[PDB]
C-alpha cells in the first residue's frame, strides 16, 4: 500500500469514558464500569465522577467477601469494588488474548520458584502482560488477601482467567437477551456487528429481516460455543484460505466443516445456518467469508484498537519544515 | 524481482528437466544452511529415464533423522516441496494440524497423494514424482500419509538440519570451536557492530574452547523459544534494569524449561556483552536469534517498513528533482 499501519490503542480512552471514581487525581473503575466498558464503547448516563476520600475508597471494597469467587465474581459486586488503570489493561489483555497463559511472565516473577507470586510483583505482571504506596483494590484483595499476606498461585490465576472469560460471555448474553433467557437472532446479529461500524450494514440487516423469520432464537449454550469459535478465528482463516487458493466457493456444509475443524466442536445448525444466511452477502449460496473474518476480528478486539497510517503526513511535515528552515539560512547568506 | 525463497532455490537447484528445476536432498540441506553455493553447482540436464534412477535412492535410506543425508544426491525435490520444507524449518512450532484436518476428507488421520500439493501451498503461504511423494504415498501413490508419520518427519527434519549444521561448522569432528559456533550464530547477520562481536570472540575466549553436539542442539532449541526469551527481556527493559549473567541464565532456563550448560551460556554472554559492562546487549542478541531462525529466507515486519521508507526517500528525491525542473 502507501504507508505502514500502526495499531493505535484506545484502551485509555475507554477507561476514561467508563471510570466512575476519582481519588487524588487518579481514576478508577468499579466492577460494573469494567463489565460495561468491555461490552460497549459509550456510557449510558454521562454521570459525573465521584470524588472519594481515603476512607471512602477504603469503604467501597470493605463489606465484600460476599461475592461468589467463580464466574459471577464481577457481576455480584455491582459497584462495590475498585479497579486501577493498570489492572484494567491486564484484564483487557486477558479478554483479547484468551488462549494466552502468560506462563513466562508468571515464572519470571516467581522468584522462589513455588508457582506463586507476591503482591509486590502484581503490577509488574500487569505491565508485562498488557504491553504491545497505592490504594487497595478488588484484585489485590482477592489474590493477595486483605493486608497482602497470601500469594497468588498460578493455577488460581488460570482459574481466574477462565472465570473471567465465562463471565463476560454470560454478561454479554444477558445484555443482548434483555435478561429474558433466550436471544432473538435479531439481537445476536446486533451483538455480532457491534464493533463493525464500517458501512455495509444495509445488506446485513436486510439479510436479517428477509432471511431468518420472526421468532427464531439461540440459547446461552449456542452463544458461548459461538464465542469460542470466535476465539479460534485464525484456524478458521486458514481453512478459508485453503478454499481461496483452490478458487472454490464456501457452501453451507463446507462452512460447517471449517467451523468443526477450527473449534473441534459441533456448533448447532440453528446457529451456523443463521450465520451463513447473514454473511451470504450476495444472492448465491456462498459465504462471503472475507467480510465475515473481518467481523470476527472486530468482535474479538472490542473497539480497543484502531488501525491508521498517518506516518507519511508527519514525514512530509518534517520535510517541509526542515527544507524551509534550511533555505532561510542558505540563501539569506547567498544573494 | 524474485522472492528470497525462489532466489535461494535458483542458487542451489542442480537438476533440470522439461524446463523445470529441481533440488536433490543434498542441495536442499545446503540450501537452508548457506546463501551462496561455493563451486556454482553444475546444472545437470535430465530426461525421463534419468530422474527414475535418481529417485531409486529411496530403496536404501533410513527414515529417521539421517534420511536426507543417506540419500545424498539420489533424490528429487520440487519448488513447492521446497517451500514446504523451508516453512517446517523456519516455523518449527506450528503443527499444521488445521491444514491436515481440512485435506483429510474421509475423517481419518490421513491424506492422499492428491492433497499433498494443496498441503504444501497452504502451509507455505506467508506429477513429476519426487522423493517425498514416494516416501509418503508410495511409488504409485498407493498409500496415504498419517498425521503422526507427518509430525515425526517434521521432528526428524529439524534434527537432521541441526546435526548437519554442526558437522559443517565442526569440520567433521565431534567438537565445534567456539569461534565457529560464533560464525554460525552470526551467519545471517550483516555488518552492524560485527567487528565488536569478533573482537569479543578473539579477546574474551581462550584458545581451544569448544562445545558438544548436545550443547549446539540445546542452543538451537533455545533459538526456537526466542519469543518467550523476548518477553523475559522486556520485563527487565521495563524495569530499567540490566541483564547480568545470572539474570541471563534464569531467563534462558525459563524460556526453555531446560538446563543449558555454563560452557555455552558464558560464551554467548561474553560475545553479546557489546559495551564491556557485565551486562547483556539483549536487543541486538534477540535480533541475531531472529536472524538465525529465519536463515535469510524471510523479510519480517521491521525490515519491510525500513525498506518502504528507503523507497519513500528515493521517490522523494525524484519528486524534488522533478518539481525543480518545473521552473526552468
Curated annotation (Swiss-Prot), chain B:
Highest rank taxon of the organism: Eukaryota
Record's subcellular location: Mitochondrion intermembrane space; Mitochondrion inner membrane
Cellular-component GO terms for this entry: calcium channel complex; mitochondrial inner membrane; mitochondrial intermembrane space; mitochondrion; uniplex complex
PTM sites of type Phosphoserine: 124
Binding site for Ca(2+) 1: 104, 106, 108, 110, 112, 115
Free-text disruption phenotype from the record: Mice display diastolic dysfunction, characterized by left atrial enlargement and delayed sarcomere relaxation and cytosolic calcium reuptake kinetics in cardiomyocytes. A significant proportion of mice die from abdominal aortic rupture.
Biological-process GO terms, alphabetical: calcium import into the mitochondrion; cellular response to calcium ion; mitochondrial calcium ion transmembrane transport; negative regulation of mitochondrial calcium ion concentration; positive regulation of mitochondrial calcium ion concentration
Tissue specificity comment: Predominantly expressed in stomach, intestine, skeletal muscle, kidney, heart, testis, prostate and uterus.
Molecular functions (GO terms): calcium channel regulator activity; calcium ion binding; calcium ion sensor activity; protein heterodimerization activity
The EF-hand domain, residue ranges: 91-126, 127-160, 191-226, 260-295
Keywords of this entry: Calcium, Disulfide bond, Membrane, Metal-binding, Mitochondrion, Mitochondrion inner membrane, Phosphoprotein, Repeat, Transit peptide
Protein residues bound to Ca(2+) 2: 273, 275, 277, 279, 284
Record annotation: effect of changing residue 273 to A: Strong reduction of mitochondrial Ca(2+) peaks
Function text: Calcium sensor of the mitochondrial calcium uniporter (MCU) channel, which senses calcium level via its EF-hand domains. MICU1 and MICU2 form a disulfide-linked heterodimer that stimulates and inhibits MCU activity, depending on the concentration of calcium. At low calcium levels, MICU1 occludes the pore of the MCU channel, preventing mitochondrial calcium uptake.
Family statement drawn from the similarity comment of this UniProt entry: Belongs to the MICU1 family. MICU2 subfamily.
Domain notes per entry: EF-hand domains 1 and 4 have high affinity for calcium and act as sensors of mitochondrial matrix calcium levels. EF-hand domains 2 and 3 are degenerate.
Subunit relationships: Heterodimer; disulfide-linked; heterodimerizes with MICU1. Component of the uniplex complex, composed of MCU, EMRE/SMDT1, MICU1 and MICU2 in a 4:4:1:1 stoichiometry.
Name assigned to this protein: Calcium uptake protein 2, mitochondrial
Organism encoding this protein: Mus musculus
The encoding gene: Micu2
Amino acid at each position: 500500500y502507501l504507508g505502514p499501519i500502526e495499531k493505535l490503542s484506545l484502551r485509555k480512552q475507554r477507561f476514561m469514558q467508563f471510570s466512575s471514581l476519582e481519588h487524588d487525581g487518579e481514576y478508577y473503575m468499579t466492577p460494573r464500569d469494567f463489565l460495561f466498558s468491555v461490552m460497549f464503547e459509550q456510557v449510558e448516563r454521562k454521570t459525573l465522577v465521584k470524588k472519594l476520600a481515603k476512607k471512602d475508597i477504603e469503604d467501597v471494597l470493605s463489606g465484600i467477601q460476599t461475592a461468589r469467587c467463580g464466574s459471577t465474581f464481577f457481576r455480584d459486586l455491582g459497584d462495590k469494588g475498585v479497579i486501577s488503570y493498570t489492572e484494567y489493561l491486564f484484564l483487557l489483555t486477558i479478554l483479547t488474548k484468551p488462549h494466552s497463559g502468560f506462563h513466562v511472565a508468571f515464572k519470571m516473577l516467581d522468584v522462589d520458584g513455588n508457582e506463586m507470586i507476591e503482591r509486590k510483583e502484581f503490577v509488574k505482571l500487569q505491565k508485562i502482560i498488557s504491553k504491545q504506596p497505592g490504594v487497595n483494590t478488588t484484585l489485590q484483595v482477592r489474590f493477595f488477601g486483605k493486608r497482602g499476606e497470601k500469594k497468588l498461585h498460578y493455577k488460581e490465576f488460570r482459574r481466574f482467567m477462565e472465570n473471567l472469560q465465562t463471565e463476560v460471555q454470560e454478561m454479554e448474553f444477558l445484555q443482548f437477551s434483555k435478561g429474558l433467557n433466550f436471544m432473538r437472532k435479531e439481537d445476536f446479529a446486533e451483538w455480532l456487528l457491534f464493533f463493525t461500524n464500517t458501512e455495509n450494514k444495509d445488506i446485513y440487516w436486510r439479510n436479517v429481516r428477509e432471511k431468518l423469520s420472526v421468532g427464531e432464537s439461540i440459547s446461552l449454550d449456542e452463544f458461548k460455543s459461538f464465542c469460542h469459535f470466535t476465539t479460534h478465528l485464525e484456524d478458521f482463516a486458514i481453512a478459508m484460505q485453503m478454499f481461496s487458493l483452490a478458487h472454490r466457493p464456501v457452501r453451507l456444509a463446507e462452512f460447517k466443516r471449517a467451523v468443526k475443524v477450527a473449534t473441534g466442536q459441533e456448533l448447532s445448525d440453528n446457529l451456523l445456518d443463521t450465520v451463513f444466511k447473514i454473511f451470504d452477502l450476495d444472492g448465491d449460496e456462498c459465504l462471503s467469508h472475507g467480510e465475515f473474518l473481518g467481523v470476527l476480528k472486530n468482535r474479538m478486539h472490542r473497539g480497543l484498537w484502531v488501525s491508521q497510517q498517518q506516518s507519511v503526513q508527519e514525514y512530509w511535515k518534517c520535510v517541509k519544515k526542515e527544507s524551509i528552515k534550511g533555505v532561510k539560512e542558505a540563501w539569506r547568506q547567498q544573494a
